[PDB]
């Protein structure tokens, strides 16, 4: 009896919350992201009998990254020269080479434009890909840039090229980060190997659709994550461990040519073409790909106990989802992937190479917004990049009869980062509490 209040201080205990986070950059920096904050020495401590829950669909920092990436891009591109004076009527006879149907933009379109001394116009010419051009009404010889009817077009600064430098986050004073490490976690539910860290590991701001590439890899066997409020999910994430390699190339040699727009900012385009004309392509090892698909199918049936499973190519929409989209070197790509998904199944080491034929277009839009088309300058020479994939984004039709079907999508840029920040949940510490005891003053 006669227990009296004792007030301990600093006791470890936390509650849910959401807060701004610091971002740290690598020591050998890019030359808030450019030079600092500095790079720490990461640490990780394992804890006994720690009980905690996670929810990869609600965790805060996923939203924050969306603001960070777009804000960084705008901060970087804001001062670069606008292209507004370039947007005028074009004349595009364009039949001056032995083969033109592949591109249809040629040298020798031509258009009037301003030059150094301002008050006298000049005539020039350069190349374009028809996917960046549209035809005006009536006269089939007049053309306009696609996005100029609605927006201004900004040109990437020629001396600058942002690229996927990894970024990792550090909680501010008072908050702590929990990680979880169970290797069969579905992305929602309790963990039994909780842990705490100084900061998160590296994450790249990679952009792609129909699959996420150049990213990290899983630990155990393939995993499938989804929401569970209703079967009618938006986007199902499948996470690989077995890395499947991929290559792509742009054989032709592009020649760089330029115009300069008094008040003195340069503009770039594509000029002469060198070498024999060909189409860009990529390669894949059928054995590895089909084995991976087999494993996915044999894991995929767990949520769908008994129906047949069949894959079919995406359907409809702008090119940002009908095809695979990714960038190497500083130019963008679009690749039809019908052949890589026309398969089926039912219940109960480099031979056979596959090839896929792609296209490249210049003018791009940030994958949701309107009114901010980015224009890239052509890269002279030829480009080739090795790469490897780690996961896929699957959405499902209406399930009919004894069969079920999936198809590739993922146009929302939110999901990509949802697939690499499923680990962390940020909480605040409450260093004050109370308890009873019996000590007496004795003053």
């Amino acid at each position, epitope marked *: 009896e006669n227990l009296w209040v004792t007030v301990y201080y600093g006791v470890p205990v936390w509650k849910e919350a959401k807060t701004t986070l610091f971002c740290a950059s690598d020591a050998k920096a890019y030359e808030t992201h450019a030079c600092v904050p500095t790079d720490p020495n990461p640490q990780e401590m394992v804890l006994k009998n720690v009980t905690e829950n996670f929810n990869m*669909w609600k965790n805060d920092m996923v939203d924050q990254m969306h603001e960070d990436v777009i804000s960084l891009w705008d901060q970087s591109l804001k001062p670069c020269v606008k292209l507004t004076p370039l947007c005028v009527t074009l004349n595009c006879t364009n039949a001056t080479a032995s083969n033109s149907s592949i591109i249809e933009g040629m040298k020798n379109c031509s258009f009037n434009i301003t030059t150094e001394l301002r008050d006298k116009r000049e005539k020039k010419n350069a190349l374009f890909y028809k996917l960046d051009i549209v035809q005006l009404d009536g006269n089939s010889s007049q053309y306009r840039l696609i996005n100029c*009817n*609605t927006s201004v077009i900004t040109q990437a600064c020629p001396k600058v090229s942002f690229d996927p430098i990894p970024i990792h986050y550090c909680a501010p004073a008072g908050y702590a980060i929990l990680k979880c490490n169970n290797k069969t976690f579905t992305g929602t539910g309790p963990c039994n190997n909780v842990s705490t860290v100084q900061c998160t590991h590296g994450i790249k701001p990679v952009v792609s659709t129909q699959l996420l590439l150049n990213g990290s890899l899983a630990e155990g066997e393939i995993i499938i994550r*989804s*929401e569970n*409020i*209703t079967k*009618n*999910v*938006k*986007t199902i994430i499948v996470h690989l461990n077995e890395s499947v390699k991929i290559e792509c190339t742009r054989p032709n040699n592009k020649t760089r040519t330029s115009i300069r727009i008094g008040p003195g900012q340069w503009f770039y385009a594509t000029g002469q073409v060198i070498g024999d004309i060909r189409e860009a392509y990529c390669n894949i090892n059928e054995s590895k790909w089909n084995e991976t698909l087999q494993r996915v199918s044999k894991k995929l049936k767990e949520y769908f106990p008994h129906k047949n499973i069949t894959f079919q190519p*995406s*359907s*409809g*929409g*702008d090119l*940002e*989802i009908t095809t695979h989209s990714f960038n190497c070197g500083g130019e963008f790509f679009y690749c039809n992937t019908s052949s890589l998904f026309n398969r089926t199944y039912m219940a109960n080491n480099s031979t056979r190479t596959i090839t896929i034929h792609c296209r490249i277009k210049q003018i791009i839009n940030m*994958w*949701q917004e*309107v009114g901010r088309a980015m224009y890239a300058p052509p890269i002279a020479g030829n480009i080739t990049c090795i790469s490897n994939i780690t996961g896929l984004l699957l*959405t499902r*039709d*209406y399930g*009919k009869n004894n069969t079920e079907t999936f198809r590739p*999508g993922g*146009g*929302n840029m*939110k999901d990509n980062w*949802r697939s690499e920040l499923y680990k962390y949940k940020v909480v605040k510490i409450e260093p004050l509490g109370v308890a009873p005891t019996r000590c007496k003053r004795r003053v």
Partner: nanobody
Amino acid sequence: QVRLAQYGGGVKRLGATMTLSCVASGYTFNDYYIHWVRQAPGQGFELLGYIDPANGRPDYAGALRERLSFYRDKSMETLYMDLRSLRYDDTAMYYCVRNVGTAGSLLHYDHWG
């Protein structure tokens, strides 16, 4: 406050192609789906398919994948529907409805048109 108005429709000749349309109002165009639902007179409803405005993905009911067609144009917040080879049994009303949704799941409809 939020509205969804329709144009077109009217009578059509048998076996002919037909069009409809919705015009969005200033709630937000990139943050919600859109559905099409039709109602034969004195019959229970049924759904056709849903078109996202973000990127343009369609998805069709199993009974009409040969005949329907969707596409959008974000520049003016507009959505067009193409229906090919009308049959006598398609005579009905057509609506145009919004659909709340979270980052990972869909839910009820709220603002019919």
